[PDB]
Write an enzyme that holds these catalytic residues in place. Structure first.
Site, PDB file in Angstrom:
ATOM      1  N   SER B 245      -7.297 116.553 -45.067  1.00 50.91           N
ATOM      2  CA  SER B 245      -7.691 116.408 -46.487  1.00 50.91           C
ATOM      3  C   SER B 245      -6.586 115.788 -47.344  1.00 50.91           C
ATOM      4  CB  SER B 245      -8.172 117.739 -47.091  1.00 50.91           C
ATOM      5  OG  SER B 245      -7.152 118.757 -46.973  1.00 50.91           O
ATOM      6  N   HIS B 275     -11.123 121.064 -39.527  1.00 46.95           N
ATOM      7  CA  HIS B 275     -10.136 121.211 -40.576  1.00 46.95           C
ATOM      8  C   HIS B 275     -10.455 122.304 -41.570  1.00 46.95           C
ATOM      9  CE1 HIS B 275      -7.186 120.438 -43.621  1.00 46.95           C
ATOM     10  NE2 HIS B 275      -7.738 119.403 -44.236  1.00 46.95           N
ATOM     11  N   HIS B 321       0.262 129.229 -32.940  1.00 43.89           N
ATOM     12  CA  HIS B 321       0.616 128.012 -33.629  1.00 43.89           C
ATOM     13  C   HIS B 321       1.457 127.160 -32.704  1.00 43.89           C
ATOM     14  CE1 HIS B 321       2.179 125.338 -36.902  1.00 43.89           C
ATOM     15  NE2 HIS B 321       0.996 125.605 -37.428  1.00 43.89           N
ATOM     16  N   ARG B 330       1.329 133.099 -45.465  1.00 44.61           N
ATOM     17  CA  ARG B 330       0.088 133.153 -46.243  1.00 44.61           C
ATOM     18  C   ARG B 330      -0.831 134.242 -45.721  1.00 44.61           C
ATOM     19  NH1 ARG B 330      -1.956 127.186 -45.371  1.00 44.61           N
ATOM     20  NH2 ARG B 330      -1.389 127.987 -43.276  1.00 44.61           N
TER      21      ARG B 330
HETATM   22 CL   LIG Z   1      -5.868 118.791 -40.428  1.00 48.63          CL
HETATM   23 CL   LIG Z   2      -4.313 122.604 -44.306  1.00 47.13          CL
END
Ligand SMILES: [Cl-]
Ligand SMILES: [Cl-]
Ligand SMILES: [Cl-]
Ligand SMILES: [Cl-]
Ligand code: NA
Lengths: 436, 441
Positions: B245, B275, B321, B330
């Site tokens: 994005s 996404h 990750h 977060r």
């Molecule tokens: Cl992405």
């Molecule tokens: Cl993101």
């Protein structure tokens, strides 16, 4: 004979396996270096994208699956009574690397026409958009509104396997391509005409349905649409429209949302407006010289432009060393159909004198014209004078180029696109370390 | 002093010329330095690892997590202004920090909030177009349609058409950006009210901050959900420039499309299921687990469910990750929110039990690098608590947040004169020719 989907289904497994072997065996080969100036320069020069259908040959112009524009004009099938290459036959070539037969292209045209009806909510939406909303914004809105039809979105939600992705992407792509002439023409008729639109001819080829739905029945304008769509179709994968379509599609957005995003890129004035930029410049010139197109007057006009620090639009290329063959194809169309049209006399005289002036001025590399230096004059001759619509026509053509690559990306499993960013503070730290 | 404080636009105008000059000098004096190599597998691998983009507002620290202008999530939470009565960082304060690199004062933020609220009205044609879209047209498609339909308002498009100097580009991009940001809560809330509720919507409160207006327009006037929207928008705002994005918004903007067309394209990238739907993917997985274990969240039952999943060849969404080496801060901020507001909510107990048991199981199974959760493992449970249960709307909320991150970079790109983005492609046959040439000599 095989349909396009059947031929692609037959040939793509071996091509996918070839790419898989090439990646595994040679993936660690270094193919370039990234300089700091490239990260701060729009990634110019970074060999970072795979785009099968077209590659710029610095010595010969854009090639479509290895063929130059004159080779495409010779090899692609033609509508009866025409010598223009059919853009749906180019769609076939871009997707498969092969030239379809007359009978194959006839069946593909009929399939596109059968898929061309747009839903009521999209007709309604279009009919209600304001007339000052730019035609490109109307076009991308209408394409996004078709997302409720997406067969790929539905198949993904049902959990189909990745092996099935390209088949659904192919169905959405043909459905979308089929609908573009109707969407584009509805925008044209609503904004610029009386809002009334004819119906698709089930037996017409794609450019012919575009021309007639816009309201143009002249047979030579039909041939212009066939040629215009073919030559604007594709130009590698690094231009903003193709790249944005591919980027959004890499996150598995459907062809509808991917093309709508690509169209918003094409709408950017550094990408999709050069035809209109040239036309405005030609109109200002024509008024300022009162129609005097003598070499002396044109040469002076070019020098006065350049001395003022203004550009001669549509001339010069960083890489291509000769006239763009897409310019030449349009010059040849004008010479055969209207060589004495006054606006063409101007375009043709600029071609005779601008390269030499631009060379002497010394600031323009490869001072030869591109496609956008010749498209507007052809549209003007037939009365399609509404220049704020012209990028819509470009967007219909560019869908022919970008939709095959979405289908191939899904057939071969191209991953999400994800280059790395840093802030300037971090790039400075990295550069300081490197230089130590 | 009896003089008023700088507004955001005035502060940016004061500081950006020197930063632009520093970038220009950096490019001049170090542009020829080699910062990486491109491997064939990167061109066939989505450009992964290519250091090709400049994004000022956020950078992932592989040891700490995402940083916003150098600050960690806990630092953002401490240092950004808060609404009166609240402990949550204000997302418009983060917009200020992302654009300027500076922490605003309370008074500066209050004035920015008032400016965004004054810019919140959508034109009649967008109201009527939204109210006429089919309820089955996905919320993200409605969202990007409505943003594109504001292009008739674009101040940058009009200035470009008048041939303004490039010096003026960022100023018009700034106005369009604030105008667009101010309208996203009304657009997103009209979609929610039309598709999922009774079509009726309240009006913007001129004195409310941004997350508070989003919450009340969606239909919530109660403090704790207001606070959730402030936190949610802040933490989802930005995450470097290479995600789809952010990258799409920058790419379309680099051709000088306005913020309306750039953000609409970025929203179509966020709509892609690789996404923008990880929150919903986690939610679906948690609900399937909950039905299978009939609400038994004992550590032993959850451990067995995770082993059974992994042993069957299935994945645990939202954990693992590629580079980040600990729990995403977060995620931690959302866990802290749950422990403060609803520590024994049942779906949070499930999320909490996964947090306790999954890292060990994933480690012992041995196929998951950095087996810790990300932001999307925790966001759905928070929305569920408050009754915002319509998962097909969740990426619209993410898109409102992500506009906070991407719009500052469009303004910065125009101020520094970032050029059109144009990497190079080749076909596989030409790559093969190029590789043969390299591998031969
Ligand atoms: Cl992405
Ligand atoms: Cl993101
Ligand atoms: Cl192009
Ligand atoms: Cl481009
Ligand atoms: Na429907």
């Amino acid at each position: 004979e095989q349909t396009l989907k059947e031929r692609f289904a037959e040939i793509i497994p071996a091509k996918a396996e070839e790419i898989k072997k090439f990646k595994k065996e040679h993936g660690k080969t270094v193919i370039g270096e990234v300089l700091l100036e490239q990260a701060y320069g729009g990634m110019r020069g970074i060999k970072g994208l795979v785009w099968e259908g077209s590659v710029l040959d610095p010595e010969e112009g854009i090639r479509f699956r290895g063929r130059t524009i004159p080779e495409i004009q010779r090899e692609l099938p033609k509508a009866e009574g025409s010598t223009e290459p059919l853009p749906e036959a180019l769609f076939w070539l871009l997707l498969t690397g092969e030239i379809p037969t007359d009978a194959q292209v006839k069946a593909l045209s009929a399939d596109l026409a059968a898929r061309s009806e747009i839903p009521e909510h999209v007709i309604q939406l279009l009919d209600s958009l304001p007339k000052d909303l730019h035609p490109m914004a109307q076009f991308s809105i209408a394409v996004t509104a078709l997302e409720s039809e997406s067969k790929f979105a539905k198949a993904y939600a049902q959990g189909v396997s990745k092996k099935e992705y390209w088949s659904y992407t192919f169905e959405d792509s043909l459905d979308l391509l089929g609908k573009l002439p109707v969407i584009a023409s509805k925008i044209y008729r609503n904004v610029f005409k009386d809002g009334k639109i004819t119906s698709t001819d089930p037996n017409a080829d794609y450019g012919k349905n575009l021309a007639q739905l816009l309201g143009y029945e002249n047979k030579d304008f039909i041939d212009l649409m066939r040629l215009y769509l073919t030559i604007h179709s594709d130009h590698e994968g690094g231009n903003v429209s193709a790249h944005t379509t591919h980027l959004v599609g890499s996150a598995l957005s459907s062809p509808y949302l991917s093309l709508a995003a690509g169209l918003n890129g094409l709408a950017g004035p550094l990408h999709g407006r050069a035809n209109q930029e040239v036309l405005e410049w030609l109109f200002k010139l024509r008024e300022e010289v009162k129609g005097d197109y003598s070499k002396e007057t044109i040469e002076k006009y070019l020098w006065d432009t350049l001395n003022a620090g203004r550009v001669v639009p549509g001339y010069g290329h960083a890489v291509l060393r000769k006239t763009d063959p897409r310019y030449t194809a349009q010059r040849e169309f004008a010479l055969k159909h209207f060589p004495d049209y006054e606006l063409f006399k101007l375009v043709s005289t600029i071609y005779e004198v601008a390269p030499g002036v631009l060379t002497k001025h010394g600031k323009t590399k490869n001072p030869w014209p591109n496609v956008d230096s010749h498209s507007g004059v052809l549209l003007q001759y037939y009365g399609l004078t509404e220049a704020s619509f012209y990028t819509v026509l470009f967007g219909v053509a560019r869908a022919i180029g970008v939709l095959p690559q979405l289908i191939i990306d899904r057939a071969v499993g191209a991953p999400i696109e994800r280059p790395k960013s840093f802030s300037t503070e971090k790039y400075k730290e990295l550069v300081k370390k490197i230089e130590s």
